[PDB]
Each structure stands twice: as structure tokens, then as C-alpha cells.
């Protein structure tokens, strides 16, 4: 919403925020190499696509398409101090015991909606490969339905027979108070 104002389009309402969310879900992708992608978009106009708001009024966006999700890898674009998702993944790995991180390097599982951009698995693998030692096999696992992985796994879990003793019954709550939840389960 903030980066689209430099082309003239101004979305300020909450409804317009929903419109911009739809634009993001339809036109944005992750660039494998950000710098030369930027130079390419500057040179030609083959990256420009068009979107039609729900009153006519087509809008055309250029390098915004990949500048929007690039923030995941350079969170300094929005004034945050953290590191990109590739770097926090690598740090979380390197915070684990040296014997399991070879098997962690090869089972990076992606989940949730924000991991649905075209080309995010390739960029992620490139970055982690550049960070990790040159002997490990980096494998990014990105299922085609990863937007509902949490719900699917939750149904699998709640269906297990060995899980039917892990519920928090009403009686346990009546005994222990709301603090039952984290104190035991």
C-alpha cells in the first residue's frame, strides 16, 4: 500500500487494504536475484502486468511485484532490524546440536499463506545454500497445499486414538481453573 503511491495509486481505506491484499496474492513473486531483476525491470517493460480494480480503472505495476515480498529477505525495507527468513532459519539451525543439523538442513518444511509466492522455495534454497557448508544437501519442502498444512495436521492429530487422553476435560478445568492449560497440557 505504501509502495504503490509512487505510481499514483492511493489506497487508504480498510476496504482498499483488502483490494491491495488481492493485488498481492495475484501479481507478486520472489525474485531469485534481486539486483539484476531490478536492473531488468528498469531496462525493459516485460515485467509489467495489469490489474483491474472493482470499478474499472486498470492499474499497472512493475518492480513492485517483487519488491513487495522481497521484504521477507530484507526486513530493513520496513525499518525492522531483524534478518531475513533465510538467515533466521539458518540461525535456528545453528542453534541446535551439531548431530541433528545435517538432518535439519534437508527438511526445511514451508507452511502458511505467506510462503505461497512463486519462486520463494528457489530463493530460500539459494540463500541457505550460500550460508550452509558446501557439503550439506539443502532441501526446501514446499507442498502445493501448504496454506492449509496446520489444519490438515490438526485433523490428523485430533483423529489419533492415542490422543484421546490428551484433551482437557471440563472436570479438569472445574478443578484447576483456567491455568490448567499451560500447566499440564
Amino acid at each position: 500500500m505504501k509502495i504503490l503511491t509512487e505510481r499514483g495509486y492511493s489506497f487508504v481505506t480498510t476496504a482498499e487494504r483488502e483490494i491491495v491484499r488481492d493485488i498481492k496474492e495475484k501479481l507478486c513473486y520472489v525474485a531469485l536475484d534481486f539486483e539484476n531483476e531490478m536492473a531488468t525491470a528498469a531496462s525493459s517493460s516485460s515485467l509489467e502486468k495489469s490489474y483491474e480494480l472493482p470499478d474499472g480503472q486498470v492499474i499497472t505495476i512493475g518492480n513492485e511485484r517483487f519488491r513487495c515480498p522481497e521484504t521477507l529477505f530484507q526486513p530493513s525495507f520496513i525499518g525492522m532490524e531483524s534478518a531475513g527468513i533465510h538467515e533466521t532459519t539458518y540461525n535456528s539451525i545453528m542453534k541446535c546440536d551439531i548431530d541433528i543439523r545435517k538432518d535439519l538442513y534437508a527438511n526445511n518444511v514451508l507452511s502458511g499463506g505467506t510462503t505461497m509466492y512463486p519462486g520463494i522455495a528457489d530463493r530460500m534454497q539459494k540463500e541457505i545454500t550460500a550460508l550452509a557448508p558446501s557439503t550439506m544437501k539443502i532441501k526446501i519442502i514446499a507442498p502445493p497445499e501448504r496454506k492449509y498444512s496446520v489444519w490438515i495436521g490438526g485433523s490428523i492429530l485430533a483423529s489419533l486414538s492415542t490422543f484421546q487422553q490428551m484433551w482437557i476435560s471440563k472436570q479438569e478445568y472445574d478443578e484447576a481453573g483456567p491455568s490448567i492449560v499451560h500447566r499440564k497440557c
Partner: protein, 60 residues
Amino acid sequence: QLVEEELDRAQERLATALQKLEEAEKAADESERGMKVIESRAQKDEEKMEIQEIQLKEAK
């Protein structure tokens, strides 16, 4: 006789005009049908083209 001759001649010509209008609106209907099917086809083709071009992008 001028009154009644203008009357019935203009009336039958008005009938011909309304039939021409019905023909014109049916032409509008068929043209609109062609337009809608063709634009839907164009939409499908364009979205598939975009999928395939980005697939070549990732592949290469």
C-alpha cells in the same frame, strides 16, 4: 385523403422500423454472446500463458 394515407403508410413504415429494431437487438444479443465467449477464452489463454512463462522462468 392525405390524412389517412400518411396515417397508414407511416404506420406500416413504423411496423417496419420496429421490426428493424428487433433485428438490431437480436444482432446485439448474438454479438454480445460472441464477445463474452471470446473474452472468457482470452482470459483462460492469458492466465495459462502466464503460468507457463513463469514456469520457464523458474526452470531455467
